[PDB]
Scaffold this active site. Structure first.
Site, PDB file in Angstrom:
ATOM      1  N   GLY D 135       0.790  -1.211   0.000  1.00 15.81           N
ATOM      2  CA  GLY D 135       0.000   0.000   0.000  1.00 15.81           C
ATOM      3  C   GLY D 135       0.826   1.267   0.000  1.00 15.81           C
ATOM      4  N   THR D 170       3.361 -13.089  -1.299  1.00 18.90           N
ATOM      5  CA  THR D 170       3.235 -12.939   0.144  1.00 18.90           C
ATOM      6  C   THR D 170       1.868 -12.409   0.550  1.00 18.90           C
ATOM      7  OG1 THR D 170       5.615 -12.535   0.287  1.00 18.90           O
ATOM      8  CG2 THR D 170       4.277 -11.913   2.181  1.00 18.90           C
ATOM      9  N   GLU D 245      22.466   9.667 -20.811  1.00 23.44           N
ATOM     10  CA  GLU D 245      22.697   8.918 -22.043  1.00 23.44           C
ATOM     11  C   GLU D 245      22.052   7.544 -22.007  1.00 23.44           C
ATOM     12  OE1 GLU D 245      27.109  10.980 -22.815  1.00 23.44           O
ATOM     13  OE2 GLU D 245      26.860   8.799 -22.834  1.00 23.44           O
TER      14      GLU D 245
HETATM   15  N1  LIG Z   1      13.275  -7.855  -2.705  1.00 24.25           N
HETATM   16  C1  LIG Z   1      12.648  -7.579  -1.567  1.00 24.25           C
HETATM   17  N2  LIG Z   1      11.274  -7.476  -1.546  1.00 24.25           N
HETATM   18  C2  LIG Z   1      10.625  -7.200  -0.389  1.00 24.25           C
HETATM   19  C3  LIG Z   1      11.337  -7.014   0.781  1.00 24.25           C
HETATM   20  N3  LIG Z   1      10.461  -6.751   1.769  1.00 24.25           N
HETATM   21  C4  LIG Z   1       9.211  -6.763   1.251  1.00 24.25           C
HETATM   22  N4  LIG Z   1       9.294  -7.049  -0.086  1.00 24.25           N
HETATM   23  C5  LIG Z   1       8.170  -7.149  -1.032  1.00 24.25           C
HETATM   24  O1  LIG Z   1       7.227  -6.130  -0.763  1.00 24.25           O
HETATM   25  C6  LIG Z   1       5.909  -6.610  -0.957  1.00 24.25           C
HETATM   26  C7  LIG Z   1       4.934  -5.921  -0.007  1.00 24.25           C
HETATM   27  O2  LIG Z   1       5.305  -4.579   0.205  1.00 24.25           O
HETATM   28  P1  LIG Z   1       6.212  -4.191   1.475  1.00 24.25           P
HETATM   29  O3  LIG Z   1       7.455  -3.455   1.033  1.00 24.25           O
HETATM   30  O4  LIG Z   1       6.579  -5.436   2.244  1.00 24.25           O
HETATM   31  O5  LIG Z   1       5.286  -3.248   2.390  1.00 24.25           O
HETATM   32  P2  LIG Z   1       5.071  -1.708   1.998  1.00 24.25           P
HETATM   33  O6  LIG Z   1       5.612  -1.426   0.617  1.00 24.25           O
HETATM   34  O7  LIG Z   1       5.746  -0.841   3.025  1.00 24.25           O
HETATM   35  O8  LIG Z   1       3.480  -1.479   2.036  1.00 24.25           O
HETATM   36  P3  LIG Z   1       2.654  -1.640   3.407  1.00 24.25           P
HETATM   37  O9  LIG Z   1       2.205  -3.071   3.530  1.00 24.25           O
HETATM   38  O10 LIG Z   1       1.450  -0.735   3.371  1.00 24.25           O
HETATM   39  O11 LIG Z   1       3.522  -1.281   4.593  1.00 24.25           O
HETATM   40  C8  LIG Z   1       5.976  -8.103  -0.713  1.00 24.25           C
HETATM   41  O12 LIG Z   1       5.199  -8.787  -1.667  1.00 24.25           O
HETATM   42  C9  LIG Z   1       7.437  -8.472  -0.865  1.00 24.25           C
HETATM   43  O13 LIG Z   1       7.617  -9.274  -2.007  1.00 24.25           O
HETATM   44  C10 LIG Z   1      12.722  -7.115   0.767  1.00 24.25           C
HETATM   45  O14 LIG Z   1      13.364  -6.954   1.801  1.00 24.25           O
HETATM   46  N5  LIG Z   1      13.378  -7.400  -0.411  1.00 24.25           N
HETATM   47  N1  LIG Z   2      40.574   5.910 -29.892  1.00 26.80           N
HETATM   48  C1  LIG Z   2      39.758   6.091 -28.826  1.00 26.80           C
HETATM   49  N2  LIG Z   2      38.415   6.023 -29.016  1.00 26.80           N
HETATM   50  C2  LIG Z   2      37.556   6.197 -27.984  1.00 26.80           C
HETATM   51  C3  LIG Z   2      38.104   6.462 -26.649  1.00 26.80           C
HETATM   52  N3  LIG Z   2      37.057   6.593 -25.818  1.00 26.80           N
HETATM   53  C4  LIG Z   2      35.935   6.428 -26.558  1.00 26.80           C
HETATM   54  N4  LIG Z   2      36.228   6.189 -27.847  1.00 26.80           N
HETATM   55  C5  LIG Z   2      35.242   5.968 -28.931  1.00 26.80           C
HETATM   56  O1  LIG Z   2      34.229   6.973 -28.866  1.00 26.80           O
HETATM   57  C6  LIG Z   2      32.930   6.401 -29.039  1.00 26.80           C
HETATM   58  C7  LIG Z   2      31.976   7.047 -28.046  1.00 26.80           C
HETATM   59  O2  LIG Z   2      32.048   8.462 -28.185  1.00 26.80           O
HETATM   60  P1  LIG Z   2      31.554   9.429 -26.998  1.00 26.80           P
HETATM   61  O3  LIG Z   2      32.427   9.254 -25.782  1.00 26.80           O
HETATM   62  O4  LIG Z   2      30.105   9.165 -26.653  1.00 26.80           O
HETATM   63  O5  LIG Z   2      31.729  10.905 -27.614  1.00 26.80           O
HETATM   64  P2  LIG Z   2      31.043  12.172 -26.886  1.00 26.80           P
HETATM   65  O6  LIG Z   2      29.543  12.042 -26.961  1.00 26.80           O
HETATM   66  O7  LIG Z   2      31.467  13.439 -27.588  1.00 26.80           O
HETATM   67  O8  LIG Z   2      31.476  12.220 -25.442  1.00 26.80           O
HETATM   68  C8  LIG Z   2      33.068   4.906 -28.797  1.00 26.80           C
HETATM   69  O9  LIG Z   2      32.469   4.181 -29.878  1.00 26.80           O
HETATM   70  C9  LIG Z   2      34.554   4.625 -28.740  1.00 26.80           C
HETATM   71  O10 LIG Z   2      34.923   3.731 -29.794  1.00 26.80           O
HETATM   72  C10 LIG Z   2      39.580   6.522 -26.523  1.00 26.80           C
HETATM   73  O11 LIG Z   2      40.124   6.743 -25.417  1.00 26.80           O
HETATM   74  N5  LIG Z   2      40.311   6.332 -27.624  1.00 26.80           N
END
Ligand SMILES: Nc1nc2c(ncn2[C@@H]2O[C@H](COP(=O)(O)OP(=O)(O)OP(=O)(O)O)[C@@H](O)[C@H]2O)c(=O)[nH]1
Ligand SMILES: Nc1nc2c(ncn2[C@@H]2O[C@H](COP(=O)(O)OP(=O)(O)O)[C@@H](O)[C@H]2O)c(=O)[nH]1
Ligand SMILES: Nc1nc2c(ncn2[C@@H]2O[C@H](COP(=O)(O)OP(=O)(O)OP(=O)(O)O)[C@@H](O)[C@H]2O)c(=O)[nH]1
Ligand SMILES: [Mg+2]
Ligand SMILES: [Mg+2]
Lengths: 430, 59, 430, 430
Positions: D135, D170, D245
């Site tokens: 909830g 649960t 990105e």
């Molecule tokens: N992965 C993970 N899931 C959790 C955990 N604790 C609860 N859940 C999940 O949360 C769901 C229920 O919601 P909860 O987080 O327990 O309770 P809430 O979100 O605070 O909602 P309220 O019941 O109103 O307090 C359950 O179906 C569980 O699957 C956790 O520690 N890890």
């Molecule tokens: N030769 C070379 N190429 C690079 C390097 N770092 C990234 N690239 C190339 O740059 C591309 C990504 O570009 P990007 O970093 O997004 O450019 P920007 O958007 O201007 O920052 C990738 O496909 C890489 O192949 C480097 O240190 N040396």
């Protein structure tokens, strides 16, 4: 060669004066005995060899608080015969403290004021503290202000009045004397600052995380605000501000001088150091409506002028970069006829911490004094409360029998109506 | 296709009653608040008229 | 005199420059602190081609580094020879393009380019006699392929008579690292043909093939590909910085290798290249250099040069050698391969000799040939582009920033027209 | 100058946030107290002197988990007032956490988000974690995403949702709120990653050889996947990838952004070192259908685009030589309109090991994020489960009485039908 005299009248006034006088003594290194184990001269005077004497006078008709002061740890600090005390309390009756028992005490207070003033050579002005919702406080404050306005004339007087909360109240008759005292100080005080208790309670609850506050916690925050306001007179700073440089910057018109304050940051040592407390975030927190020191919403009105003080290691460029951000925001709008509304002051001395208190030690702080059009709501609600009981003439016999005339209530109502009309007339754009 | 769930007509009617009761409870809150503000004016006008009459009598 | 400035953009271009400048500094004996410690007099005579002079006797490259994200330039500064670059020339944004051509050419690249154009204009206006500009960037990325190509047009609009070089890495379909490579490759090739005076394509696949087959080293890295590209880059301008029997600047190559203004896409190769274990077996002779120079696997592109006919060819020999041998070998490499040379332009091989060999080598050759076999790269790029575009896949990312499908259609049509008219001369006969 | 903020809501979200925050603190050398005894800036912030504060916020209406957090060893790390807690749980009712009790809490969370965002200068995007079958988790995640999509706009948000297993469950009512939350985040989240528990249970059983796993073992694997995804922002690499990105490389169309992940190698120290863990074998293991992190069969559908991250001492040529082998295989077929579908990233920092955990220390690892057409099966089976109980209107009264309208269930069904039709329409060849 710059001095200021603080006047404390009433129970609330004395209890906030105690709060500010621990802080000043701590900030200037003076022990509670008055002995040091050139900045002190603003608040103190040198006796020639040894102790320092505060430039303050305590007034009350009810002797309990003064007797508590004269037996605490600060018994040696204050001069024995400037703690003027009466015998009979006014008992929340305004007419008592303005016509019956205050007149016989006011002469001694005026003699003490003269004896303190002849010592000062560069007197900047007076400070006065009084809780408005009480008999002796409001009545004696009114009488003292009226006497000082004619004895000295153009000297500046500042009033840190504590108005009652919108709904929370301790008495049942406080609107009457609040309205009368507002009448009295409207034409007699140069600056009045709003200080109602409910807003500060909310501040403590939200930030300080105290769920059971007492009056001392409120008074410590008020003392910190006073220290921040008067720091510029006794410490070196890159951008200084004097008391006389206020009516030229915050008071557009002689009638309008009620403004509300805020302070930032307010945080406890348990979680203060986890965050950096930059100048931008503190100046943002200071403008938050929930951090107003009076329970009024600034979003309901325009701003007229903002005077805001910094202290610590703040740099002016960072201040300008934050004033620009605030001007940018769409939720804060200034009045049309004011293009720039900020006065900025920067000081180097960081705020001092009181041991066993609530606030932690920080290197940056901001205190703002802002004049806004939204303040009219407190006047309107106090007026509405007054009218309800004045319709049936309730509690009036307690005032007519103490020498006050019947018509004196009406003219205060007319002056409040005039003030509310003036606030509406100013806030309209051209 | 979609969803003709063969739910009991009694349950469908009860769900509709619950929906109408929820809407009626929501409607019943706000109107009272607005009414309080309207009532809140009128009092100021009555008080202000009494005040003006008495200030006139007192000059 | 006749010097050029260096401008690089994107991560790939920055990594290419980070080795190109190291190679140049090692060639001229400049320490990573900017202090000359060379041995020969000729090492300083023409140092004004790439390096500026500042107070204190140190040298600073006239390179301009631009990217839409600060990480790559914050990383290249900590590498060797990273302190040579002037901090003022570093310009970067705070957002990045995310391999989206539209963002790096219309919305974000347009506002930032003013600052980099300011420093570009500062560098060009000052220099003694401008020869031109050389550009390193990748066509497989968004910010690079957008901002670099728009900067090409902006520079061409202001300096129409100067020469412009571009070393462009095009995305091969074999080693693909980004799914949106065809879009920004096709969009970039459209603008690149209209403004670049010379273009030199480089492919990562060909570099891996060379490293695995000729050098036979086990684990290639980007440092080896960058080193090969840097050696090839340095080989082109060697005779402009050193004396020789037949000096030939970039403009002379432009005259002799471009028959028609739209046919300026070359593929290059460097010789000699030998493994560590076989560097003692081989003997460096002009026949040995020329047999490896025309080898198909030695080209820096996957394009197979015996799938087409050379329009023209160029060779830049290094070291002290007899010219008669060079000319007779060039004639022999053209008589034995008459089928792969176009017949209506006789004597289509240009040669040049520079008396200063690379540090550590006695002879070296840089090969730049304009061949019709380059059509295959544009064919496969357009094939992938039209396979992806027919379903409008990933089109919304580009169309959400003011671009439309009409500019895609025009780019595809112009690229196909280029492909067709480039092979038109392959079947032409006299 | 690059930052990211992670949001944890619900019991599962908080329990996986704890898992990722031991790993980050361990990987950056920060002690559990927050004190070190420039890469930290992506996840942390400097307080000026000493401790670091995570850029994370924990949300829940039920106070038990937060109270457990605030008393463990990590009590000093997190800021005291960013662990927002409620009083009353939603009790698996989606309508509660979207209409009744979540609205009064969402304002504080948004205020905290603003206070954290104003500190960042280069904000890349947001991360959010929430178990869907609950909830408060689903409801508050939906409400927060809806508020953020309008407060900030184009900033990227990534969702690591945990859908229920095909047969293992649960709760008994989780299909309803799973479908509603899928409705909500379909038009509001840029990336959604599948994380159902059954597949990870099988992974642990087969590879880690644990016959009695608990939730911590699952959360550690999820934390490792998160660290592998975000390593490229805070460590130097030969081929970097940013968060922005992604929609240009993995998201062909705005509606289709649900993809499933895998990780390799997963092996215990007792038998890890007996085999060489070459890049080819790990990249083969990553594409095995039995090693999918979500219980879906990739053999039942086409691939659209594969983004897969390496870290360690891997060389690009070995990566290309392995991408070629995968393209060769006849059991893995890509969609017709995508000639190249691989985006490759290479980083140098090897994965870090958590003491007392399951995974051993290795020098090479691979994490793949793959978008495939086969994901429609989970939607179909969830839809079938939903229809069975919605035919008789079971459990609906628990939702109608919490302010939700009757027709709100139908439109989620229509949107799922639209999504399933869209997935079929995309996967057909031209
Ligand atoms: N992965 C993970 N899931 C959790 C955990 N604790 C609860 N859940 C999940 O949360 C769901 C229920 O919601 P909860 O987080 O327990 O309770 P809430 O979100 O605070 O909602 P309220 O019941 O109103 O307090 C359950 O179906 C569980 O699957 C956790 O520690 N890890
Ligand atoms: N030769 C070379 N190429 C690079 C390097 N770092 C990234 N690239 C190339 O740059 C591309 C990504 O570009 P990007 O970093 O997004 O450019 P920007 O958007 O201007 O920052 C990738 O496909 C890489 O192949 C480097 O240190 N040396
Ligand atoms: N902020 C603050 N307000 C106080 C304090 N003590 C009293 N007040 C306020 O003062 C109002 C009444 O006036 P008091 O100061 O208590 O009494 P007084 O001014 O001496 O007038 P008298 O009743 O005639 O003695 C109350 O409504 C309180 O709100 C205090 O310690 N701090
Ligand atoms: Mg009293
Ligand atoms: Mg719960």
């Amino acid at each position: 060669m710059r001095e200021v005299i603080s006047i404390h009248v009433g129970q609330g006034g004395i209890q906030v004066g105690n709060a500010c006088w621990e802080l000043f003594c701590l900030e200037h290194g003076i022990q509670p005995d008055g002995q040091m184990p050139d900045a002190f001269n603003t608040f103190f005077s040198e006796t020639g060899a040894g102790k320092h004497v505060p430039r303050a006078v305590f007034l009350d008709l009810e002797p309990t608080v003064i007797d508590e002061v004269r037996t605490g740890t600060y018994r040696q600090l204050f001069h024995p015969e400037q703690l003027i005390s009466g015998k009979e309390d006014a008992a929340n009756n305004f007419a008592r403290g303005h016509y019956t028992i205050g007149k016989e005490i006011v002469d001694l207070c005026l003699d003490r004021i003269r004896k303190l003033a002849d010592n000062c050579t560069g007197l900047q002005g007076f400070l006065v503290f009084n809780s408005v919702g009480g008999g002796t406080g409001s009545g004696l404050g009114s009488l003292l202000l009226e006497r000082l306005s004619v004895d000295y004339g153009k000297k500046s007087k500042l009033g840190f009045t504590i108005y009652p909360s919108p709904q929370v109240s301790t008495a049942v008759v406080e609107p009457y004397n609040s309205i009368l005292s507002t009448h009295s100080l409207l034409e007699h005080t140069d600056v009045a600052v709003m200080l109602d208790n409910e807003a500060i309670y909310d501040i403590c609850r939200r930030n300080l995380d105290i769920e059971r506050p007492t009056y001392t916690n409120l008074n410590r925050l008020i003392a910190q605000v006073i220290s921040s306001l008067t720091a510029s007179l006794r410490f070196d700073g890159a951008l200084n501000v004097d008391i006389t440089e206020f009516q030229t910057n915050l008071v557009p018109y002689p009638r309008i001088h009620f403004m509300l304050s805020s302070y930032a940051p307010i945080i406890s040592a348990e979680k203060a150091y986890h965050e950096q407390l930059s100048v931008a975030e503190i100046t943002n927190s200071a403008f938050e409506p929930a951090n107003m020191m009076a329970k009024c919403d600034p979003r309901h009105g325009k701003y007229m002028a903002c005077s805001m003080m910094y202290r610590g290691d703040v740099v002016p460029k960072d201040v300008n970069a934050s004033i620009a951000t605030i001007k940018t925001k769409r939720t804060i709008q200034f009045v049309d006829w004011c293009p720039t509304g900020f006065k900025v002051g920067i000081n180097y001395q960081p705020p001092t911490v009181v041991p066993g208190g609530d606030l932690a030690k920080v290197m940056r702080a901001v205190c703002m004094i802002s004049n806004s059009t939204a303040i009219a709501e407190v006047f309107s609600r106090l007026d509405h409360k007054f009218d309800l009981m004045y319709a049936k003439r309730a509690f009036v016999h307690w005032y007519v029998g103490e020498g006050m005339e019947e018509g004196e209530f009406s003219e205060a109502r007319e002056d409040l109506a005039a003030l509310e009309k003036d606030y509406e007339e100013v806030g309209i754009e051209t | 296709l979609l969803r003709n769930p063969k739910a009991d007509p009694k349950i469908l009617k009860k769900l509709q009653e619950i929906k109408v009761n929820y809407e009626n409870r929501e409607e019943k809150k706000k109107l009272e608040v607005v009414k309080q503000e309207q009532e809140t004016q009128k009092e100021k006008e009555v008080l202000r008229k009494q005040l003006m009459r008495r200030s006139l009598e007192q000059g | 005199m006749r010097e050029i400035v260096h401008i690089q953009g994107g991560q790939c271009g920055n990594q290419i420059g980070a080795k190109f400048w190291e190679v140049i500094s090692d060639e001229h004996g400049i320490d990573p602190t900017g202090t000359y410690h060379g041995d020969s007099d000729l090492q300083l005579e023409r140092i004004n081609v790439y390096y500026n002079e500042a107070t204190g006797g140190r040298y600073v490259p006239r390179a301009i580094l631009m990217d839409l994200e600060p990480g790559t330039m914050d990383s290249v500064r900590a590498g060797p020879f990273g302190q040579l670059f002037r901090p003022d020339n570093f310009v970067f944004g705070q957002t990045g393009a995310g391999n989206n051509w539209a963002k790096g050419h219309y919305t974000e690249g347009a506002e930032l380019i003013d600052s980099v154009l300011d420093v570009v204009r500062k560098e060009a206006e000052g220099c003694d006699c401008l020869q031109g500009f050389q550009i390193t960037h990748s066509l497989g990325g968004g910010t690079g392929s957008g901002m670099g190509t728009l900067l090409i047009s902006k520079v061409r609009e202001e300096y129409p008579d100067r020469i412009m070089e571009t070393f462009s890495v095009v995305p091969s379909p074999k080693v693909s690292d980004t799914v949106v490579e065809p879009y920004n490759a096709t969009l970039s090739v459209h603008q690149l043909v209209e403004n670049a005076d010379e273009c030199m394509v480089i492919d990562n696949e060909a570099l891996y093939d060379i490293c695995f087959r000729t050098l036979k080293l086990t684990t290639p890295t980007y440092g080896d590909l960058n080193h090969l590209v840097s050696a090839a880059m340095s080989g082109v301008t060697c005779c402009l910085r050193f004396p020789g029997q037949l000096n030939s600047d970039l403009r002379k190559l432009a005259v002799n290798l471009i028959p028609f203004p739209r046919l300026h896409f070359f593929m290059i190769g460097f010789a000699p290249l030998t493994s560590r274990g076989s560097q003692q077996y081989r003997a460096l002779t002009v026949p040995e250099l020329t047999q490896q120079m025309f080898d198909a696997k030695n080209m820096m592109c996957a394009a197979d040069p015996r799938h087409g006919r050379y329009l023209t060819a160029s060779a830049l020999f290094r070291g002290r050698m007899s010219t008669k041998e060079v000319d007779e070998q060039m004639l022999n490499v053209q008589n034995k391969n008459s089928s792969y040379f176009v017949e209506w332009i006789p004597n289509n091989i240009k040669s040049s000799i520079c008396d200063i060999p690379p540090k550590g080598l006695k002879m070296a050759v840089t090969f730049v040939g304009n061949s019709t076999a380059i059509q295959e790269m544009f064919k496969r790029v357009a094939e992938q582009f039209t396979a992806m575009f027919r379903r409008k896949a990933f089109l919304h990312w580009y169309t959400g920033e003011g671009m439309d499908e009409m500019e895609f259609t025009e780019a595809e049509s112009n690229m196909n027209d280029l492909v067709s008219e480039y092979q038109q001369y392959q079947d032409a006969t006299a």
